[PDB]
Write a protein that binds this ligand. Structure first.
Ligand SMILES: CCCCCCCCCCCCC/C=C\[C@H](O)[C@H](N)CO
Ligand SMILES: CCCCCCCCCCCCC/C=C\[C@H](O)[C@H](N)CO
Lengths: 245, 97, 48, 297, 297, 245, 49
């Protein structure tokens, strides 16, 4: 009665029989932009069900040596379904998200992933190793798209900050002996009421194994982690031709 | 609910019971395809095994929503998550998940 | 269409293959119209 | 006019942010209530499920037999303003005579507080911050000496013309705000408002400032937030001829009327560059002190 | 719950079709009112502006001095049912003995009323039509003779098995409706309901019945409307041995309880094929009679 | 006060100073499908402003020998803007249209175009000339797209029917000495509450010169006719992957 | 396993609109289905047989 759950939105329904409750980031639900916070004057389009549904974008394989991955929002969806289309024809976009990371195993496997949401996840480089070179991450590393991107130095989140303190961000854990998924709901986070779904990534999703995957020889070794997400309260404005970047 | 012969391939007398169920097994993690079939209830195919499809044959037209319930018969220690999708008219057989 | 969302995982000692059974029926908004004869006639010659 | 049901019962447009939590007054630390032994089944405060993502709700009273303690310890010093409203170094400007940098008697400092670690680390604890600020300018010779010299400090907002010489016409300062002060005078001090076009300055902007292909050349612009670029601060000795003395100006900033949103992990690797989280990949150090064994001190 | 203004005042969802016109009773032709001369400026009923797309509103009374006429001429005969509820030929079926077509004693007729021009042209005056129908089957030998022969007519809806022989098991007609009648009997006659899955049959469907590439081979399906394909009508002599006489069956259809939508230009070129507006490009004739000069009769 | 007009819908505004009123086809305004006429159960998407706006799709040149052209709806828009996108991801579509055909000249030019709307405009062939061959029009002739298609035998509308009786369909005339545009508003016309925007064209727009273009040598000879249209009360249902045909 | 059919409705698996369904269920009643005459017997009375 808390281990079992069902998420239905749009024409998509998700189930789980081993849940660990739901986190509502920063203790707040996605809402539409108010007439007093708003600044742009054009009447927005709120496509509803065609874009506020569950998109299942990726699957990574968890290995005894995996480092961890991250995806950027809304970058992951800008080229998918009706949502991607609206994000392209419009300058302005705002929305919330319901994230559902899935990973099941067996009662004989073990391991724990940390699933967190980090607003304004700015990536850094190793500065030529020595730290004397002012290098910067390439577009494909900052907006990895749907395939996400593997962390090079998980301990400092590839940004000079301790992953040990990452729990200060909305999160959940997928500890195999306990659950098989994390569900986090995120409201719009920005200093503006609207923004470009192309130039700016409001937050990054991180999935990092903190307690390594393990099992005896003979148990299924292919342990996938799948990413499913649904935009919520999607609003768009500033219409023109489609643009991909 | 009556049994839908999704696995309508075996035809030799001794294997007919096999059409009553289809399998699943450990995979390679590429979101592989497990099975497919047309939702058309009064059309030749899996639905002919169901009483619904049968009664359907005595009428020219029909209207309504349908439901298919899948029961997993693996051991209690087996886990898994599947994605089952209904693709409305116009959309061809999904090439990938 | 049915796809593997993750994978069929099992520990040591359990079968690597299992089956699914599908049951189908109609919802309550379901109705039929225009009574016709069925496409099949289960008879070859005369039934004696 | 609306008529179809789904439209009427639609929640599309709800602008109220349903909030699951609310702030309560907490002027002092919490008190400890008396507690006695408990030998029950079903009741299990000690056991938690961290996977959920919440912190343990277990209190002292439920884990040991406690006495009563009236806690009057104040929580006032840990408020944003208490923590931030303390002036700290954010800028240093050199005006040497015979030099490689500013031998021309003036200097332009692009307002960026990320040049100094102490201050930088504090602010970067949050993602968004809104506040007013008090700036104080401490000037003297490189030996910490005071000389009878007159300076002009001018705030040059983005778009205003930047002085290019100690004699630039820009120094007329007809519309920009300028401060004329002597080194002999106490340090100059002013109040500045919240000037971003955004509702808050943001120490971290995960994006690009413009549309287009983001090729190698334009990768230096990843994370560039115009909303944080408040302008330039220009200083000059006030004269046509060169000043007889070399000078240094230290800029101190004290935040006030502060508001912050979205706390984040605190920097644990040395800083290398302004506005850019780059860290030395070869000198990645653990956050703290280390030991030889987990079973020993 | 809704909150932002634009959402509240939105008209998205209005399911009522605002109608600019409405029907009025008109049992008789309109009367003529007395009129006298008018010598005015500003008032100009005679002048119109056809570009607008409406017909002239000028009445007799305003163009000449009229008397009063009480018009009691009925308008009853021009109602859809008056016009359509008259049986006409729609199908002809031949059951010859020694022949090239149906020498096997039975026949299947795909229900399509576009095989005969008189009827076809009338219905095609409208785009959509909904109605019930009365079918009458007139059978006799090719000379118009009556013989003591027994027939079976069976309605075979789409999906039901089609007889392939005079002895098909399909003739058991356990669920389909069949009519057994003799040529000596008066013609068989039945009522049929509105059977389309659509709200109305449509004589014109500008589209394709399926998705996909619409290559040359599948161009024969342009305009194919399954919603108009009601099924087959099968007839057979009732016996194992072949019938001694050659037969012909004429099918007459009388529409009743008719409703029509979207009037269109009436066919003006000879018909060539069933359900398909193809016309002979080389014999494109003007709609009517022609003359030698516009200034002569 | 009837010659002058302004049409604003979405983020597009059209003006004309030489109008001839507005026709509302079959005396009825575009409305959304009611809960009693509807049959499909999924909650539809009504994108509003992003698709109910003015698209300006084509320009043809009027010549002293032009025969006339026709366009099919909604075929003309299936590959344009946000509307085209919705028409592709969804099986079901319904909408109305506001058509604005434009053509200006001078007080010294003359000619009159007939602008009409013909529901279910099924095209026929000349059947091999003799009429012995059962030929059928190719996809490119039945759904000409945005470029429209030139009539081969305007007198019989390439379908065996008299163009002289075409006025029985919602229409207007652009008679140069009088106006410079036609505006026709069309409600959804079909025997179903929804349909495929791909397989079925609810109606065709015809623009045919009935009184030929003429002017003396020296006056501007390039007389364009431009087509602008706006969907109204657009509704979509039956979501899946995008499909172009 | 219980032996009952699924109680899950459309409304609970996807976001549905409202639809007023007036589709009749009259044609599927026992008499509608069975009260249609069909062949059940054939009897031959030949001469020389
Ligand atoms: C008389 C002139 C006095 C000079 C006035 C200086 C006003 C500066 C406003 C404070 C702005 C806060 C700092 C903002 C951003 C950070 O320094 C960096 N740009 C972040 O990348
Ligand atoms: C005892 C059996 C009697 C036969 C019953 C015949 C019922 C036929 C229903 C009338 C349908 C109206 C005609 C419909 C479509 C047109 O003929 C063409 N298909 C148009 O292409």
């Amino acid at each position: 009665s808390d281990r079992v759950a069902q998420l239905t939105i749009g024409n998509s329904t998700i189930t789980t029989q081993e849940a660990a409750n739901i986190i509502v980031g920063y203790g707040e639900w996605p809402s539409y932009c108010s007439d007093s916070d708003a600044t742009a004057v054009d009447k927005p389009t709120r496509p509803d069900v065609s874009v506020n549904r569950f998109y299942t974008l990726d699957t990574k394989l968890w290995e005894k040596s995996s480092k961890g991955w991250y995806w950027k929002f809304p970058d992951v969806l800008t080229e998918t379904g009706v949502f991607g289309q609206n994000a392209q024809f419009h300058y302005l976009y705002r929305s919330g998200f319901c994230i559902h990371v899935q990973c099941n195993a067996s009662k004989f496997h073990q391991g724990a992933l940390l699933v967190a949401v980090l607003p304004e996840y700015v990536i850094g480089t190793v500065a030529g190793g020595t730290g004397t070179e002012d290098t910067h991450p390439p577009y494909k590393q900052t907006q990895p798209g749907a395939d996400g991107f593997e962390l090079q130095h998980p301990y400092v989140l590839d940004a000079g900050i301790p992953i040990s303190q990452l729990t200060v961000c909305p999160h959940q854990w997928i500890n195999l002996r306990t659950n098989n998924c994390a569900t986090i709901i995120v409201p719009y986070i920005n200093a503006l009421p609207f923004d470009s779904a192309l130039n700016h990534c409001n937050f990054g999703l991180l999935v990092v194994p903190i307690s390594p995957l393990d099992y005896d020889q003979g148990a299924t070794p292919v342990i996938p982690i799948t990413i499913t997400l649904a935009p919520m309260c999607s609003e768009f404005a500033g219409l023109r031709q489609a643009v991909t970047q | 609910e009556t049994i839908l012969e999704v696995n309508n391939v075996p035809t030799n007398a001794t294997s007919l019971m096999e059409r009553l169920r289809f399998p699943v097994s450990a995979q390679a993690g590429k979101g592989e395809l497990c099975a497919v079939f047309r939702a058309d209830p009064g059309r030749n195919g899996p639905w002919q095994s169901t009483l619904l499809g049968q009664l359907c044959g005595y009428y020219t037209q029909w209207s309504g929503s349908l439901e298919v319930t899948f029961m997993f018969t693996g051991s209690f220690m087996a886990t898994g998550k599947m994605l089952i999708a209904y693709t409305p008219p116009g959309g061809p057989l999904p090439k990938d998940r | 269409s049915i796809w593997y969302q993750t994978n069929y995982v099992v520990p040591i000692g359990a079968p690597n293959t299992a089956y699914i059974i599908a049951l189908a029926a109609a919802q309550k908004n379901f109705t039929m119209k225009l009574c016709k004869d069925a496409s099949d006639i289960l008879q070859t010659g005369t039934i004696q | 006019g609306d008529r179809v049901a789904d439209v009427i019962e639609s929640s599309i447009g709800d602008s109220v942010s349903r909030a699951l939590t609310h702030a309560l007054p907490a002027p002092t630390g919490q008190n400890t209530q008396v507690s006695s032994h408990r030998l029950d089944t079903g009741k299990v405060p000690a056991l938690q499920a961290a996977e959920i993502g919440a912190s343990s709700n277990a209190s002292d009273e439920s884990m040991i037999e406690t006495r009563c303690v009236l806690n009057s310890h104040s929580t006032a010093e840990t408020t944003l303003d208490s923590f931030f409203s303390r002036a700290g170094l954010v800028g240093e400007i050199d005006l040497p005579l015979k030099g490689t940098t500013n031998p021309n008697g003036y200097a332009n400092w692009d307002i960026d507080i990320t040049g100094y670690a102490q201050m930088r680390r504090k602010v970067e604890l949050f993602t968004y911050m809104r506040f007013d600020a008090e700036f104080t300018f401490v000037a003297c010779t490189p030996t910490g000496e005071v000389v009878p010299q007159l300076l002009q400090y001018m705030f040059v907002p983005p778009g205003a013309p930047k002085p290019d010489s100690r004699e630039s016409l820009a120094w007329q300062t007809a519309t920009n705000p300028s401060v004329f002060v002597k080194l002999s005078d106490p340090p100059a001090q002013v109040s500045v408002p919240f000037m971003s076009p955004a509702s808050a300055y943001q120490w971290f902007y995960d994006g690009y400032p413009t549309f287009g292909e983001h090729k190698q050349e334009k990768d230096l612009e990843y994370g560039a937030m115009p909303n944080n670029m408040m302008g330039t601060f220009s200083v000059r000795t006030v004269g046509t001829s060169k000043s007889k003395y070399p000078l240094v100006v230290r800029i101190y900033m004290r935040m006030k009327h502060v508001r912050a949103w979205i706390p984040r992990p605190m920097r644990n690797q040395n800083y290398l560059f302004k506005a850019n989280p780059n860290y030395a990949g070869n000198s990645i150090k653990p956050t703290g002190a280390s030991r030889t064994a987990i079973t020993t001190l």
